[PDB]
Every structure is written in structure tokens, then in C-alpha cells.
Amino acid sequence: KFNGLTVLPPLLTDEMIAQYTSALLAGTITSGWTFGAGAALQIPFAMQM
Amino acid sequence: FLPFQQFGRDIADTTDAVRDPQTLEILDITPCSFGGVSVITPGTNTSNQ
Numbered sequence A: 001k002f003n004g005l006t007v008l009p010p011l012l013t014d015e016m017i018a019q020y021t022s023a024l025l026a027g028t029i030t031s032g033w034t035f036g037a038g039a040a041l042q043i044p045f046a047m048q049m
Numbered sequence B: 001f002l003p004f005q006q007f008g009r010d011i012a013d014t015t016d017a018v019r020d021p022q023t024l025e026i027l028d029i030t031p032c033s034f035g036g037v038s039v040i041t042p043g044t045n046t047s048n049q
Helices: A015-030
Strands: B007-011 B014-017 B027-030
Touching: none
Parallel strands: none
Antiparallel strands: B007 B014, B014 B027
């Protein structure tokens, strides 16, 4: 930004993109394939495999 | 700065520093701040804020 090329910051910061990832991981560990196609349905991961 | 060095440049080959030709002082050159004007307004039929 000192030489005249302005870098605009992204709308999603690093903590929230990482929160999107942790949300998608927590959903795969718990809800599995359900929350992508609908409401999150709790299933144990031992039965998920 | 070394004794024979008048000014100096950064990685962009733009001058980031200059030494006083009269007295002895070393100052960094930072261009003046600028940027774009972003307008936050709702629709014309909502309000004028």
C-alpha cells in the first residue's frame, strides 16, 4: 500500500474462515452426511463408517 | 546510510529514504495516505441515510 497498490482486506477474516472449517468438521464428526442435505441428524461416528 | 549515500530505494525501486544534502539526518519516505470512498446506503425507496 506504500507504493500505490491498494490491497483491500477480505470480507472473511482468518478466524471466521477457520470457524467455517471447524463447523464443517464438527458436522462431519457428528451429523455426517445429513446436514448437507437438510437438518443436522445426530449419528455416532462408529455407525457412520 | 554510508557517507556517500544521498538517497535510497526499497524493493520496488521507489525512493523510501533520503539524506539531507545540507545537514546530516536520515528520514524514511512514506507516500501520503489515500484510498477509495465507499458509500453505505440502503435503497432509494428505503431511506436517505
